[PDB]
């Protein structure tokens, strides 16, 4: 299925035109609310005293059709930024008239064009109209990939099209949008209707729109080639862009007349569906993650909070993660118990944070395929999950597993362990206080003990997503700091965003920690070479971990564990977006602070521009010890 609409500037009969467009297979119609050539005077007589009606009546369609099938379009003659004062005033009154009439109809979306550099007064009228009530109407800004001046035919004898490649000049259309939405203060009711041309710009100009709230892609009938049968097709580069837009689930809009006379108007439509049936289906991770795209969530704290039943159920729904743990345990047992001691040496395993017992079974399965004897200790502090363990221990496990309902930092073990297995890692490696837990539990580990995981490392990467910045910006709460939402991380399936640099390691922890500098406080400085122009909104968070030797788990996209869908990237936002030029370096500084009660992250940008230090003294975000 593809949600596709039809753009029109000529509608004789709404009842007839809407029926024909629907019979061709479209979902909605982009049409003008007033006649596009019907200019209207508002100041000077006698043209303003023109007798009505000014447009069609709302009775021509049902309220359901206006709410789902019709998309408003501004009149072309409306020029709010005209250098002529009279034309400017009439355009202001006309723009409000058409925007108010679109709202009167309850139109789901209204189209407004961005065709020049200066749209300041245009932005003011729209911002003025948005704050006149709290309605729910969308405003699609029609902005082309390439400006019309930069795609004109080189047929002007005394004004040739300059053939000197300018990097920033080819990105001028994005600058129009960036200035426009900034003037409107990042309104949630203002999206982009990207219009595609016959000649696509350089790849960096297209990448500029990554992370931008694109809700519509306009495809003229002129950009379609012709096959042998005489049907509309697209170039392999245009196809490459169509697939990129399908991942954003944008609505494609077909504009222009039928340039393939023989094949009727539905032919352009089937071709898009043809491309939409010819793309790789989702792969496990992609399938499970569908629905959570760019959905902000609070990072879990399995220490301070007791996880619910279904929370553990999601953890257990991943065989790849636990197959690695079973493999790591299976590998360590052989390296610690030689073959001649397979029947005499019994290893002491202590699952620190067993939950409902997925690692306990993984340990039992590991000792089986390794032909070694083990004595299990299932240590869990959540009393609700201990009910599942003790029920498991009575019906199936038995005397082999010893359930311990206590905190691993307070529990006094009867003996010392050969191996300790734990899954206390979050999306940012140590964000769940895994170092503090294992350090407190480090006393009852043998001098030659093995810690699984042995080490883990966090990874950061600067990202650009005007969409996600609005998501965080909309999370301001009543009885707290109005800017606290920017000083706390979020576990989110990153989707509509743009990674600005390859991720670099941030924080690393080793277990067992033998160092006399036992101190989990960290201060790291990272410098990211940026090879494009963009706006910085936040930093993506990932992590890698070493279970045992070569057995590893990772959410770092380059080294991501295949099939393991049970971890989403974390996001450290920033208060004000930062502009980054091509070639500049983004320098970020991250701190891992901690007191006797809480642990928290502090971060700040120092290049190219200094930001404010985020979450100082954990005022807006703390992890409970």
């Amino acid at each position: 299925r593809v949600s596709s609409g039809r753009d029109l500037n000529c509608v004789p009969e709404i009842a007839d035109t809407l029926g024909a467009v629907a019979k061709q297979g479209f979902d909605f119609l982009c049409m003008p609310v007033f006649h596009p050539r019907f200019k209207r005077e508002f100041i000077q007589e006698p043209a303003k005293n023109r007798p009505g009606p000014q447009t069609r009546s709302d009775l021509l369609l049902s309220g359901r059709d206006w709410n789902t099938l019709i998309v408003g379009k501004l009149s072309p003659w409306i020029r709010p930024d005209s250098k002529v004062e009279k034309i400017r005033r009439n355009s202001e009154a006309a723009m409000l008239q058409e925007l108010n009439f679109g709202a009167y109809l309850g139109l789901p979306a209204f189209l407004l064009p961005l065709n020049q550099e200066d749209n300041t007064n245009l932005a003011r009228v729209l911002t003025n109209h948005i704050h006149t009530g709290h309605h729910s109407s969308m405003f699609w800004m029609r902005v082309p990939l390439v400006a019309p001046e930069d795609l004109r035919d080189d047929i002007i004898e005394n004004a040739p099209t300059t053939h000197t490649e300018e990097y920033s000049g080819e990105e001028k259309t994005w600058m129009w949008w960036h200035n426009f939405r900034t003037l409107c203060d990042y309104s949630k009711r203002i999206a982009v209707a990207l219009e595609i041309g016959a000649d696509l710009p350089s790849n960096h100009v297209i990448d500029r729109w990554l992370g931008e709230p694109i809700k519509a892609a306009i495809l003229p009938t002129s950009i379609f080639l012709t096959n042998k049968k005489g049907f509309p097709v697209l170039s392999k580069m245009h196809q490459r862009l169509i697939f990129r837009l399908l991942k954003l689930e944008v609505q494609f809009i077909i504009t222009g007349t039928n340039h393939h006379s023989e094949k009727e108007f539905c032919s352009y439509l089937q071709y898009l569906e043809y491309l939409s049936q010819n793309r790789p289906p989702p792969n496990a991770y992609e399938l499970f993650a569908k629905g959570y795209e760019d959905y902000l969530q609070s990072p879990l704290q399995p220490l301070m909070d007791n996880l619910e039943s279904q929370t553990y159920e999601v953890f257990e729904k991943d065989p790849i993660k636990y197959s690695q743990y079973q493999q790591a345990i299976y590998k360590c047992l052989l390296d610690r118990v030689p073959e001649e001691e397979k029947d005499t040496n019994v290893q002491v395993l202590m699952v620190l944070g067993a939950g409902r017992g997925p690692l306990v079974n993984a340990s039992l399965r590991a000792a089986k395929q390794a032909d070694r004897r083990i004595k299990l200790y299932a240590v869990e502090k959540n009393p609700n999950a201990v009910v599942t363990l003790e029920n498991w221990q009575f019906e199936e496990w038995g005397s082999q597993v010893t359930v311990v309902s206590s905190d691993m930092r307070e529990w006094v073990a009867p003996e010392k362990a050969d191996i300790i297995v734990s899954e206390l890692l979050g999306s940012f490696a140590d964000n769940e206080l895994s170092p503090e837990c294992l350090d407190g539990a480090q006393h009852f580990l043998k001098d030659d003990g093995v810690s699984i995981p042995g080490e883990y490392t966090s990874f950061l990467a600067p990202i650009s997503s005007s969409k996600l910045y609005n998501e965080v910006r909309a999370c301001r709460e009543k009885d707290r700091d109005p800017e606290a939402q920017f000083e706390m991380p979020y576990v989110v399936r990153l989707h509509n965003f743009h990674q600005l640099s390859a991720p670099q390691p941030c924080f690393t922890f080793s277990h067992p920690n033998r160092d006399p500098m036992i101190d989990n406080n960290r201060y790291c400085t990272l410098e990211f070479p940026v090879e494009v122009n963009t706006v910085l909104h936040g930093f993506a968070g990932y992590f890698e971990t070493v279970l045992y030797q070569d057995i590893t788990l990772s959410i770092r996209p380059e080294t991501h564990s295949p099939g393991m869908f049970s971890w989403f990237p974390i996001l450290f936002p920033i208060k004000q977006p930062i502009t980054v030029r091509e070639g500049q370096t983004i320098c970020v500084r991250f701190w891992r602070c901690s007191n006797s009660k809480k642990v928290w992250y502090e971060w700040a940008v120092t290049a190219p521009v200094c930001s404010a230090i985020h979450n100082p003294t954990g005022r807006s975000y703390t992890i409970g010890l």
Binding site: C10, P12, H35, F38, Q44, D154, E157, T221, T257
Partner: protein, 299 residues
């Protein structure tokens, strides 16, 4: 042919004196247009006393005669239409209707030979047509905004002017590898009119109400109107007068030095087209969106 659209868009005279009328329905339930012929100019705009009439599918943005029985139309549907009168001149049959522009065709003009024409549309595209073969000879994308007006050269069949909202006034010559030649910063041009007795001279009006006199071999101007200048038509006299139209609902007739000689405020809405009478040169007919067809006695 019973209900005529209220917004009269164009009015043109031919040789014998018949009046061509093109209207559009710019509001209401149906948005379409119509073509009418009035062998009695005093009978217009009444439909009961007309010579012929036909209903079109969409509105009429701009039209012009193609000889003595041909009617070239620029429709909102993005198609260039050609209508021709029968042998008895009682019907108006459609000759062809080619949908080649991707947006409203805003302006159209017949070249000198009468066998080719140039069409300007809101799709930033200008096309050259072959009225005989009913095909588009060339398609130029020289401007960067909506094409406002295109005017063919009165005597050179390969030359024509064009103005767009990109503040560009282009002089065209299809005999050259690069046909477009920009002419010289002010407010946007909105109407073009060649001089009927000088090949290298034309006039243009801007959106601010200023008609200017331009010599091709690269300046006189005067503030004629208070709003956008809609049209500019030269009288058929030996020393032709200049009739200017505007959105201020006024008509002005200028001399050789752009001085105001006659002023008419008869129209209550926008004044769209103006045509001089070939039988009586001192008479000038104007139409507008107020559904009026006024005949002015120019002193």
């Amino acid at each position: 042919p019973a209900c005529m659209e209220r917004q009269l868009e164009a009015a043109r005279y031919r040789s014998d004196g018949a009046l061509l009328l093109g209207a559009s329905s710019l509001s209401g339930r149906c948005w379409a247009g119509s073509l009418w012929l009035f062998k009695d100019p005093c009978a217009a705009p009444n439909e009961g006393f007309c010579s012929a009439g036909v209903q079109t599918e969409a509105g009429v943005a701009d039209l012009t005669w193609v000889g003595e029985r041909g009617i070239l139309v620029a429709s909102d549907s993005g198609a260039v239409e050609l209508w021709e009168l029968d042998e008895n001149e009682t019907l108006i049959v459609s000759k062809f209707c080619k949908y080649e522009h991707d947006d409203i065709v805003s302006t159209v003009s017949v070249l000198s030979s009468g066998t080719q024409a140039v069409s300007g549309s809101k799709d930033i595209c200008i096309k050259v047509w072959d009225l005989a073969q009913q095909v588009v000879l060339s398609s130029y994308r020289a401007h960067a905004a909506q094409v406002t007006c295109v005017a063919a050269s009165p005597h050179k069949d390969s030359v024509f002017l064009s103005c767009s909202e990109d503040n560009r006034i282009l002089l065209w010559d299809t005999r050259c590898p690069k046909p477009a030649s920009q002419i010289g910063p002010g407010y946007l041009p909105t109407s073009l009119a060649w001089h009927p007795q000088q090949s290298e001279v034309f006039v243009f009006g801007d959106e601010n109400g200023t008609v200017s006199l331009v010599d091709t071999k690269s300046v006189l101007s005067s503030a004629v109107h208070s709003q956008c200048v809609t049209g500019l038509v030269f009288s058929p006299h030996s020393v032709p007068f200049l009739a200017s139209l505007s959105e201020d609902c006024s008509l002005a007739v200028l001399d050789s030095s752009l001085s105001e000689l006659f002023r008419s405020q008869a129209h209550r809405d926008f004044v769209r087209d103006a045509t001089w009478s070939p039988l009586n040169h001192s008479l000038l007919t104007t139409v507008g969106w107020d559904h009026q067809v006024v005949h002015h006695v120019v002193p």
